[PDB]
Amino acid sequence: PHDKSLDNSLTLLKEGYLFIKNRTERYNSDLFQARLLGKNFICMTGAEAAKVFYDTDRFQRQNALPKRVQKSLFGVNAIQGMDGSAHIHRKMLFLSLMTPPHQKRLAELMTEEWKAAVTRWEKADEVVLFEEAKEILCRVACYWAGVPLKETEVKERADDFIDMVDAFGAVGPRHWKGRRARPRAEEWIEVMIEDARAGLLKTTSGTALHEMAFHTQEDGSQLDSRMAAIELINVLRPIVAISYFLVFSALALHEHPKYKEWLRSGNSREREMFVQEVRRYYPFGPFLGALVKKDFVWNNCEFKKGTSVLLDLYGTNHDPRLWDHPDEFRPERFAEREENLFDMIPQGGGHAEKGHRCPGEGITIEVMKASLDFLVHQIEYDVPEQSLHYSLARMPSLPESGFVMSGIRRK
Ligand code: HEM
């Protein structure tokens, strides 16, 4: 199939997470050609594609996504555009800081933070879950990475991280908010990187600030103070991004009352399942980009070298070939499902040790289960009349009212 139009890019902006889905349905196929971002593309959807997309003997990420995304979300020349053993080397670094012990540590700081906020929320009129999340995560993330953060600095930093996430799929004021935030974080963090290297800021072995400051590339030399910031930022920023998911976690519990007592009567497993369903059902990761390395043939289609390709993450997550009533929130669909690396890919697919799959899936899940465990057991509240609606054309997406809470009371 081939969309011959000459503005798919503007269209993509109007449809968002449904852009690829809208055409893999129309053209009745798992992939289609289009003209996106100045280049010739091939958008594909589905787990079988994911399997091919993550085949690095066929796909490279270098030169894949536009600079505007680097200049607002990832940073210029960060791990995201890396390929080969160079990428697997920088990648083992992120993993070392995202292991079960850490996850455990992070969910733990959040738990007390959550419990501590209650005394404050019980006195407020309202509370905007998205705003409470932004701060706490930011304050915790730093603490955990060993990055210093003054109380009167949390908001600004918490906000700068988010302006970066909220810019990747936008044009105009929204894009710029992040084209300006980025330069402020890098600056801020590149200083600590330099201070660490001077033994002027205390750093503790095994924490992101330490490991980034002292990492060693294959050639044996260390990262430019600037790149180490960007890389430490690609740890801090993502954790603050868990704000979205957390707002969705609450939102589901509201729109799906029945699942409340379900969780409350259950254990960690009921949570684990309610979380995994939030990561699958709700929009966040739009898709991914890559360049075809060698000319190959798959699904009767010819992929020419240098052709650009988008992997629909949202669509693979809602494809009936892999899920019953994919557009239904059903925590149970996860009871007994064997673990897989391509059926569900909300934070990427395949191996994290062999590819670009998010290495923060553990932390994201662990942090989310905690957040939920709190909303369900520690407090009781009211969801006052508001705008919970969330668009699928806007990327990223979020319940308009940031999810307002009221009459919060200890449980
Ligand atoms: C809050 C929700 C999160 C979402 C939806 C998310 C989503 C994703 C996606 C879709 C990718 C790309 C996969 C690919 O390119 O093939 C990725 C990469 C990555 N994520 Fe996340 N992420 C999240 C949380 C986290 C957390 C909290 C951390 C840090 C602890 C983190 C660290 C990273 C890193 C550094 C990479 C780049 C890996 C590479 O390029 O090889 N993330 N993530």
- Please answer whether residues 361 and 390 qualify as being in contact, where contact means their C-beta atoms are separated by less than 8 angstroms: no
Q: How far is the CA of 61 from the centre of ligand 1 (A)?
A: 14
Quote the CA–CA distance of 242 and 369 in Å, as a whole number. Answer: 12
Q: What is the tally of structural domains in the chain?
A: 1
43 annotated binding-site participant: no
Query: What residue's CA is closest to ligand 1, atom 17?
Result: 358
- What's the per-residue H, E or C state across 254-301? HHCCHHHHHHHHCCHHHHHHHHHHHHHHCCCCCEEEEEECCCEEECCE
Q: How far apart are CA 221 and CA 230, in angstroms?
A: 17
Tokens coding 300: 């009767």
Domain that holds residue 37: 1-411
- Angle formed by the axes of helices 258-265 and 361-377, nearest 10°: 100
DSSP H or E stretch at residue 23: helix 18-26
Nearest alpha-carbon partner for 390 in 287, 242, 283: 283
Give the whole-angstrom CA distance, residue 36 versus residue 309: 10
Gap between the Cα atoms of 81 and 98, Å rounded? 20
Pseudo-torsion of CA 137, 282, 20, 326, nearest 10°?
Answer: 150
248: CA distance to ligand 1 center in Å? 18
Atom from ligand 1 closest to the CA of residue 242: 1
What is the residue type of 210?
Answer: H
Residue 302, token pair as written in the block: 């010819």
Q: Is 348 helix (H, G, I), strand (E, B) or coil?
A: strand
Choose among 221, 141, 249: nearest CA to 189: 141
Mutate to test the pocket of ligand 1, among 358, 365, 395, 397 (most ligand atoms within 8 A of CB): 358
CA 124 to centroid of ligand 1, rounded, Å: 34
- CB crowding 16-33: b at 16 or more within 10 Å, else e: bbbbbbebbeeeebbbbb
Residue 160 belongs to a domain with what CATH number?
A: 1.10.630.10
Structure obtained using: X-ray
Start-to-end C-alpha separation, the chain:
57
Name which of 242, 234, 238, 204 is nearest 114 in CA terms.
Answer: 242
Q: Classify burial at 283, counting beta carbons within 10 Å of its beta carbon; exposed 0-12, middle 13-18, buried 19 or more.
A: buried
Which residues are CB-neighbours of 12 under 8 A, at least 6 positions away?
19, 36
Helix (H) or strand (E) holding 26: helix 18-26
Go through the chain and tell me how many residues it has: 411
CA–CA distance, 200 with 204 (Å, rounded to integer): 13
Cα 235 to chain centroid distance, Å, stands at 11
